[PDB]
RNA sequence: UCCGUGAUAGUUUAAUGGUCAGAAUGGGCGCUUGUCGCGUGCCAGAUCGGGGUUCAAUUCCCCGUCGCGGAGCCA
């Protein structure tokens, strides 16, 4: 019933009589003249009202912000003097000839003139979406899923939906349950991912699978984690890790080219180890020129426990972080970080201010130089390539803390000091993650998941040297975000049992929770491997946010709630009756 | 579960142990023929819950509630 979208009107439409549908973005009543900025998904147009069209001018008097209206008029140009060089429809305006108010809007819970609170934006998400900046991100999402499916189809992947009311799939997180009314006492599990099912689809013979799916993990949030998120899930048969990475890297290289006009180039490949080593993170943000430099060897003989303990401990590490120009840091700045590294378990944070390297010791300033010496200090500077003006922090504890603390620090200092080049893109693959990690209760846990194949290893070899075992798994990271992760699957019942075993899953359980899989591995399973992207995160990077909820139409709070609909909600007593369940007192 | 931070008109948010709780935007009624952050005049517009301290609490303390960030947890 509309004949054009407000935002699409241009000088070319001059003369066109049009019927616009939308909302009032702004009302300017100059008494005899009313200027209404009409808006719809495409933009804003200025409709003009004047004394000729009496009733219209009068009715227009009633208009308020966000009123839902319809207007029919004619597109005329504006005199040079009235042109708005800051609006797409700027050279034009539509002279109203008729105005109809479909609906009025009560006062808005969100003032359209200023950065509203998150809590408010969420509670009234639908009004918040009306903002171009926000609506735009959802359009770019759509452009992404369109580009994705077309790319995947052209590469012969079949888009297959998997079950939501299903069995428990181990992705690491906690499972959301769903009690059965008909089968009382038993529940379903919302999928943490279609993992087990896509593997079965490979065993079924579909050769290449993919799906844009909703995944559910009952864990706590973060700016890049929602308990319900969307993955671009993919799986293949008869393909190696390299081949999988190749086509996955091509999808992404393709997304950036079509959405940002940027050619990401060939992705660098780095091992889990090289990563933790140079950046103490398996999601290295390569836009940051800084990196950890180890210096334990240099400090084994030093009579300073803080350094000597970790330097002479196999489990310990001593990493120096050279922050360019960081000598300027204030004593309170050096303290905020000192506290910051504590968040990750670091006891302290020693430093060395490099003022004049040529002047030797009298050229530097550090509360620990009395424990080091002219030569040790020079080695450390030479190593880190530290020069006049720079600072050098140190992290000394067990490998893990040094990595976590100094890893975090490296990012923080980088952003604070404006060292991190946010002008570019840093894609890369991180490969060879270990197969297992210390679970903390004496056992082990699967890094990626229990259906991940070891890089070159026999069920017998794994069952013997598990802790060491390198998984044939890979992660794609961009600008510090782990936007995708995958692995070559275990297509061998023998292997699958050895793994369940190492992960301490007894037979009874192997049968209760993974029986269908252990049996399916008996019918000629092909070699298979896959990977899943975090669609949300991929959109964040492509729409320029750092907030995952900014790319999800209806996000949840860090407390897993939906303010706009106030959910979850207390259930009806009889509802729970038919569910054979009761809340615990 | 924990740490950090915030809680004041519709909204964003200033201040404050005793008083005039300030502004912008927004709302109501005027005036106003080229505005586009319209301008302008009058009117109305608020201190999260419980407890505590205190002569007195929006303000101080504790607890609880909720948003955000982070830890744990979770790729
Ligand atoms: N809570 C979350 N909120 C938002 N995004 C999330 C969340 N959790 C994960 N992601 C994103 O999804 C990618 C794939 O998930 P994975 O856990 O790596 O593995 C899986 O789901 C395997 N089945 C994939 C495979 O083996 O093929 C992650 O890289 C990440 O960007």
């Amino acid at each position: 019933m509309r004949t054009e979208y407000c935002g699409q009107l241009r000088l070319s439409h001059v003369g066109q009589q049009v019927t616009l549908c939308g909302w009032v973005n702004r009302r300017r009543d100059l008494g005899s003249l009313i200027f209404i900025d009409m808006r719809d998904r495409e933009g804003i147009v200025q409709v003009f009202f004047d004394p000729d069209r009496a009733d219209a001018l009068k009715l227009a008097s009633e208009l308020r912000n966000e009123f839902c209206i319809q207007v029919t008029g004619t597109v005329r140009a504006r005199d040079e003097k009235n042109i708005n060089r800051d609006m797409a429809t700027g050279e034009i305006e539509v002279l109203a000839s008729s105005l109809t108010i479909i609906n009025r809007a009560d006062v808005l819970p969100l003032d359209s003139n200023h950065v509203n609170t998150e809590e408010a934006r969420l509670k009234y998400r639908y009004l918040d979406l009306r903002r171009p900046e926000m609506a735009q991100r959802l359009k770019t999402r759509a452009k992404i899923t369109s580009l994705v499916r077309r790319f995947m189809d052209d590469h012969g992947f079949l888009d297959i939906e998997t079950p939501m009311l299903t069995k428990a799939t181990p992705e690491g997180a906690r499972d959301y349950l769903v009690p059965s009314r008909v089968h009382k006492g038993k529940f379903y599990a919302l999928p943490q991912s279609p993992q087990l099912f896509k593997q079965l689809l490979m065993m079924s013979g579909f050769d290449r699978y993919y799906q844009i799916v909703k995944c559910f993990r009952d864990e706590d949030l973060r700016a890049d984690r929602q308990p319900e998120f969307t993955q671009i899930d993919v799986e293949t048969s008869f393909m190696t890790a390299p081949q999988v990475r190749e086509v996955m890297e091509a999808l992404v290289r393709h997304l950036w080219l079509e959405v940002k006009g940027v050619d990401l180039g060939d992705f660098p490949v780095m091992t889990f180890a090289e990563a933790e080593r140079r950046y103490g993170s398996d999601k290295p943000d390569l836009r940051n020129p800084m990196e950890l430099t180890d210096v334990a060897d240099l400090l084994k003989s030093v009579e300073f426990a803080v350094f000597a303990g970790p330097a002479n401990d196999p489990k310990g590490r001593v990493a120096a972080l050279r922050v360019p120009g960081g000598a300027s840091l204030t004593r309170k700045q050096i303290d905020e970080y000192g506290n910051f590294v504590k968040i990750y378990g670091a006891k302290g944070l020693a430093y060395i201010k490099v003022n004049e390297r040529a002047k030797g010791l009298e050229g530097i300033n550090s509360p620990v130089a009395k424990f080091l010496n002219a030569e040790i200090i020079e080695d450390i500077l030479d190593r880190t390539a530290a020069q006049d003006g720079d600072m050098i922090f140190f992290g000394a504890d067990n490998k893990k803390i040094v990595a976590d603390a100094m890893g975090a620090l490296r990012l923080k200092v980088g952003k604070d000091l404006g060292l991190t080049d946010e002008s570019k893109w840093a894609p890369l693959w991180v490969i060879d993650f270990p197969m297992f990690e210390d679970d903390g209760e004496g056992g082990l846990t699967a890094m990626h998941h229990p259906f991940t194949s070891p890089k070159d290893m026999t069920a017998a070899e794994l069952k013997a040297a598990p802790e060491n075992a390198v998984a044939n798994a890979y992660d794609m990271v961009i600008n510090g975000y782990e936007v995708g992760g995958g692995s070559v699957r275990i297509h061998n019942g023998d292997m699958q049992q050895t793994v369940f075993g190492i992960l301490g899953i007894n037979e009874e359980e192997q049968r209760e929770k993974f029986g269908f899989l252990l049996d399916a591995l008996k019918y000629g399973t092909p070699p298979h491997a896959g990977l899943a992207f975090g669609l949300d995160r991929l959109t964040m990077l492509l729409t320029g946010t750092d907030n995952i909820r900014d790319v999800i139409a209806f996000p949840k709070t860090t407390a897993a709630a939906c303010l706009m609909t106030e959910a979850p909600s207390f259930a009806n007593p009889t509802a729970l009756a038919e569910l054979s369940i009761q809340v615990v007192k």
Side-chain angles (χ1 to χ4, degrees):
Chain A
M1 303 295 277
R2 127 201 299 137
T3 66
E4 232 89 13
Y5 283 88
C6 295
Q8 291 184 308
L9 296 174
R10 302 310 152 75
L11 192 60
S12 67
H13 308 250
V14 171
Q16 267 33 285
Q17 169 168 45
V18 307
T19 299
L20 311 167
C21 292
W23 292 267
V24 180
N25 195 67
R26 203 85 69 188
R27 174 193 67 188
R28 286 186 293 279
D29 192 321
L30 282 56
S32 303
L33 267 49
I34 295 180
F35 283 96
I36 298 298
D37 279 349
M38 192 175 197
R39 175 204 75 223
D40 60 41
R41 66 141 70 148
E42 290 290 339
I44 303 177
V45 64
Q46 183 188 252
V47 334
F48 180 99
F49 291 79
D50 75 20
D52 276 66
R53 300 287 185 171
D55 312 312
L57 198 317
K58 188 286 185 176
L59 186 283
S61 307
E62 287 73 297
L63 300 178
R64 292 198 293 171
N65 281 326
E66 298 306 306
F67 266 16
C68 186
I69 70 179
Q70 171 166 170
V71 342
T72 162
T74 306
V75 178
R76 67 181 186 190
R78 305 205 232 201
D79 302 307
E80 178 67 16
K81 52 189 173 186
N82 277 328
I83 282 185
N84 185 324
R85 274 166 164 285
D86 296 340
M87 308 182 75
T89 63
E91 307 181 309
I92 244 66
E93 62 173 3
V94 319
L95 181 56
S97 59
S98 174
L99 172 56
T100 314
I101 296 179
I102 296 73
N103 255 289
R104 292 182 71 256
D106 293 4
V107 191
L108 310 180
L110 291 167
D111 188 297
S112 311
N113 288 121
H114 48 215
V115 174
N116 295 292
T117 54
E118 210 89 7
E119 189 174 0
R121 289 173 62 264
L122 296 177
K123 210 225 291 181
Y124 299 87
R125 225 297 178 295
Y126 49 100
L127 283 322
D128 194 14
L129 296 178
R130 281 141 78 148
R131 287 165 52 208
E133 180 189 352
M134 293 297 303
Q136 180 54 61
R137 296 195 185 79
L138 290 186
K139 301 175 192 303
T140 306
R141 246 245 197 190
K143 180 171 178 181
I144 292 173
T145 49
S146 172
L147 288 166
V148 174
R149 289 209 179 73
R150 297 192 184 184
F151 178 89
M152 300 303 290
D153 282 354
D154 194 19
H155 286 68
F157 290 77
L158 240 49
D159 188 3
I160 297 181
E161 290 177 67
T162 56
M164 293 295 89
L165 281 188
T166 189
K167 187 77 171 191
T169 301
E171 282 301 350
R174 175 184 297 91
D175 287 311
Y176 281 108
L177 307 184
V178 180
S180 185
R181 179 201 48 153
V182 299
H183 296 283
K184 54 188 178 187
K186 38 187 65 180
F187 305 63
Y188 291 93
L190 295 185
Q192 286 185 40
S193 67
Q195 184 55 49
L196 295 182
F197 288 87
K198 58 175 176 182
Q199 271 181 281
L200 290 179
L201 289 174
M202 293 303 81
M203 297 187 212
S204 297
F206 300 96
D207 194 59
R208 291 180 168 186
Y209 153 88
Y210 86 97
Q211 176 181 40
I212 306 298
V213 265
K214 220 58 171 300
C215 304
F216 311 78
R217 299 180 194 178
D218 188 19
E219 294 295 348
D220 287 321
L221 305 71
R222 233 60 136 208
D224 67 3
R225 289 164 56 190
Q226 283 280 155
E228 163 174 357
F229 62 106
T230 302
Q231 300 188 320
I232 295 182
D233 200 7
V234 25
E235 195 70 7
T236 66
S237 289
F238 308 98
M239 287 192 268
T240 53
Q243 289 175 281
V244 169
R245 285 174 217 146
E246 204 193 310
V247 59
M248 289 307 76
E249 169 168 337
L251 171 59
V252 169
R253 247 222 278 306
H254 174 66
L255 288 191
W256 259 252
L257 189 68
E258 297 296 333
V259 177
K260 311 290 292 190
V262 38
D263 192 305
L264 297 183
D266 302 344
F267 293 21
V269 177
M270 199 175 69
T271 51
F272 174 75
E274 198 192 316
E276 297 296 81
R277 182 165 66 69
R278 309 207 298 169
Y279 317 83
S281 178
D282 55 6
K283 318 184 304 175
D285 183 339
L286 274 39
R287 289 175 300 164
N288 185 322
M290 295 182 295
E291 69 182 80
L292 309 184
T293 291
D294 285 78
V295 290
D297 56 313
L298 259 44
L299 312 165
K300 287 173 55 185
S301 60
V302 106
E303 281 165 12
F304 180 49
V306 167
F307 288 1
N312 289 303
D313 185 316
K315 299 167 54 185
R317 184 184 181 190
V318 183
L321 177 62
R322 165 185 169 286
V323 343
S328 304
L329 280 63
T330 295
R331 179 53 197 294
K332 70 176 187 177
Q333 297 185 294
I334 298 182
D335 261 83
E336 44 184 54
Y337 295 140
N339 284 169
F340 176 75
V341 297
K342 285 178 170 46
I343 299 169
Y344 310 78
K347 304 188 194 73
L349 177 59
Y351 65 92
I352 296 181
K353 295 192 178 189
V354 178
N355 302 300
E356 191 171 63
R357 207 174 181 300
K359 196 158 189 169
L361 292 140
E362 304 188 311
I364 72 80
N365 176 231
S366 70
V368 302
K370 77 174 82 87
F371 300 108
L372 286 40
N373 76 63
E375 209 182 6
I376 301 176
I377 294 186
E378 261 292 298
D379 296 332
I380 298 185
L381 304 195
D382 272 347
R383 198 106 117 197
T384 61
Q387 36 193 294
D388 294 359
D390 300 14
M391 175 71 83
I392 299 172
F393 290 92
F394 292 74
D397 217 299
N398 58 54
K399 302 185 173 181
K400 178 176 171 55
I401 296 183
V402 176
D404 297 351
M406 304 306 293
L409 223 192
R410 170 183 170 274
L411 296 164
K412 188 171 188 299
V413 172
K415 287 181 297 179
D416 297 346
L417 285 288
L419 298 178
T420 302
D421 186 2
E422 302 202 0
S423 298
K424 225 52 194 167
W425 301 100
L428 73 128
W429 288 100
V430 175
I431 69 177
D432 301 3
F433 286 76
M435 279 283 292
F436 308 95
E437 50 178 35
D438 183 1
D439 103 81
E441 300 292 350
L444 293 170
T445 299
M447 267 260 188
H448 187 58
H449 58 48
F451 322 109
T452 290
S453 176
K455 197 196 179 76
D456 300 331
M457 225 171 306
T458 296
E461 307 189 299
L462 216 183
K463 190 177 193 300
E467 313 89 5
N468 305 183
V470 177
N472 184 21
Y474 37 89
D475 283 30
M476 179 185 287
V477 334
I478 296 177
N479 300 174
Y481 284 87
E482 186 221 87
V483 295
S487 80
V488 163
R489 320 303 174 187
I490 291 178
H491 57 38
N492 200 286
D494 212 321
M495 179 64 82
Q496 190 60 75
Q497 264 188 292
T498 306
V499 173
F500 287 167
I502 299 178
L503 295 175
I505 306 179
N506 56 303
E507 177 69 25
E508 191 184 306
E509 268 48 75
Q510 283 181 37
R511 288 302 313 180
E512 211 301 290
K513 47 162 56 188
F514 304 121
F516 67 92
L517 171 64
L518 286 193
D519 301 322
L521 289 168
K522 303 173 183 175
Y523 308 95
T525 102
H528 58 308
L531 164 164
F533 292 98
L535 176 61
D536 307 292
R537 296 184 183 171
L538 233 29
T539 306
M540 291 174 49
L541 294 168
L542 292 157
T543 57
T545 310
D546 54 77
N547 194 316
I548 194 183
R549 64 176 63 82
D550 269 3
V551 296
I552 295 170
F554 295 109
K556 287 183 190 63
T557 57
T558 53
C562 188
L563 298 327
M564 179 192 66
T565 57
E566 312 192 319
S569 320
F570 283 120
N572 182 293
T574 59
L576 300 194
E578 42 174 287
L579 265 48
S580 295
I581 55 176
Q582 51 181 52
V583 178
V584 303
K585 57 203 72 63

